[model samples]
Target: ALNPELVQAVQHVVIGPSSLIVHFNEVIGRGHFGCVYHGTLLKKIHCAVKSLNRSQFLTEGIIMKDFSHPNVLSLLGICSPLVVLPYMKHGDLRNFIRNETHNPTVKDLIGFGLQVAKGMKYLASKKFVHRDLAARNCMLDEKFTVKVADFGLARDMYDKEYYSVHNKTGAKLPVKWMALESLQTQKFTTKSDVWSFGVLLWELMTRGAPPYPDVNTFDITVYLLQGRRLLQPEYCPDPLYEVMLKCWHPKAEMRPSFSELVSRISAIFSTFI
Candidate 1:
């Protein structure tokens, strides 16, 4: 059931199903919730409509509803199973990396990294912790600007949809994306998100291949405890890899803040200018 306050909170933005022209044949996102679909909103702006995920439908919607930023996704309106959002023609970064026909440059990767850092930087300033920040969780718009999406809604999801899940059934978590503090204590903070951002940089540099593909999921915690890290992506410059290492420091407090990441990545961005 949707939370009464959540429904009330977004009452002004809610609309009837008739407001959208959704095409079931075109699903842009596949997820724990009902997959997001291509839809026409107000018959003008293109949109992605997340349909029929009852438990978290409104709670997560409400979280996004209040967020305002270009790098982050904002809620447009609600229509029951339909959660309307801005359409990013290129889709999420993981799929974008895998399917795009053109070759990407260091400049492009640096740009993407900077946009995500800015988005996460804003998120932390608002005091929200994104328990998940892998490449899959971020989206790319037509302009190639990265949009940090589904921000901090993980904690509001129902029992079954938890990704940082850490449950007895051991449902999947993005173990490689997690920081050491998160792995050892299951406590997540903005720093943990910063750790994941570093991993996302590796993902971008490597064209979005899965991280730690050789290590078993359970082996990751101990592996990190022993001070091992994923090998640097081939052709990845030393300085960029150095930034990645800083995020994985064993002590959580040692990780750089998201704002600092913006400054650092922007410095890295300037070289491509």
Candidate 2:
């Protein structure tokens, strides 16, 4: 039997296998993956629709179907290239950080970090690895809580810490947020996600500032290869920054697990309260 809570959550929303109809409101976001639009379902439920090519829809939809967590986006349904998702009123985390008017306290910063780490911990437990984990990829709910999204680059890793790509042709990557192994060998793993989370942590501390702002994206690989890293933001506490640096260690095996990150953030969260 399906969880009653989950069923109730979608009671008002209709779901189908391949065919769906929704009224798209406005284009909320656009990226290399595709465009995301604000939409309404049955004129009652507000939703987000991600439009993609057939292969992308098929690939992401399957992975999404296996996820059921509070911090993970709920997959309402799928209709070919259109993926129906719960409407996140606040949108992505990057914009949320960029648009914030009030100065955030340490508690607020650690709170968001903990939420993301918890979500990633769930993904890790499921043997799934999110190759792209950054502030931009995390969606914010109306309550300003985060729900991990953009499964287009996620994959099942079974029991391996590394997943390698076969082809090394020209491929765009988030260089600053990528682990050294991934940037050099095209291999991705949970540790790479950890590396990205460290960058996301830096984003939280800096209020959405781009990682390695002084370094050009194209030169980030060379910079990392030369043993340079993003410095701690002015306001970043040493302990928290130490955690971030740990994630960026050249050796992936040295990076902390998401569960450990959650505990570390939780400990930091307590210090503020």
Candidate 3:
């Protein structure tokens, strides 16, 4: 029992509040939960200090700390209410794609998709469900490298980000990105992550357009039950679209795991390489 408790007590570098300098005037991003400020850690390393007013989803850092993939967010330290992470000049993937003036080739999309899959494969092997996996949750470094981060409150202004639930008072859900079982069973699994990844692929192919555009948030469950799904992007090849199709299978057991996903993506991604 003692050893179990110790394992649960994961270690996070306790950063003294004085060591991090928050640039309060530089409002980089904000959500209902917290404001992300541009800051410098130890007066040297540039970072994004996400200040949570209190503790709502503060525990995500503990789960994030175990992740060490280039495609995953690296949690720096726990500085009180400030959650330290890398400062991505390119911002969230969704905005990065939306603001892209030029189109990305099919090969380019495959390259990006594989990076995200590799990160996800890591998460799956570790048995963690990134409940809100989406283009909005992915971060891009200046080098165009995508990092799968779940900085819950640190996101750009996306109005439809929170879907208001019916009769649930103040409950919110990311309806568009959820899987069939997630919408119905009120539970999440690795399969749900796979489903969310499928939606991410759709976003990538569409250059970051919001999923289920014109569909009401409340109607998502029924629409999905009816087997309705996002249509193929004009230039998206059938091979990649097939991968997305598998992620949205009616039965969770039918969906492919992240490792299988990576291998499948590799097969196609290499042909173009």
- The candidate scoring highest on lDDT is 3
User: How high is each candidate's TM-score?
Assistant: 0.87, 0.81, 0.88
Q: List the residue pairs that clash in candidate 1.
A: 52-81
**Candidate with more favorable, higher TM-score: 2 or 3:** 3
Per-residue lDDT of model 3, residues 1-273, tens digit only:
235444445445456778888898988877666788898888399998887764323544465566688998888776647778888888878887788585667787777888899999988888877787888888889788899886433443344555657554455778888988778766888899999999999999888878887888867888877868899998677888999999998899999999989999999888884
Candidate order (TM-score): 3, 1, 2
Residue-wise lDDT of candidate 2 within 105-222, one digit each (tens)?
A: 7678778888999999999999888887888778889887788876742222221212223345665566667887887787799999999999999999888887766775655678
lDDT of 2 at 205: 88
Question: Per lDDT, what order, best first?
Answer: 3, 1, 2
Compared with the true structure, the alpha-carbon lDDT of candidate 3 equals 0.79
The better-scoring model by lDDT among 1 and 3 is 3
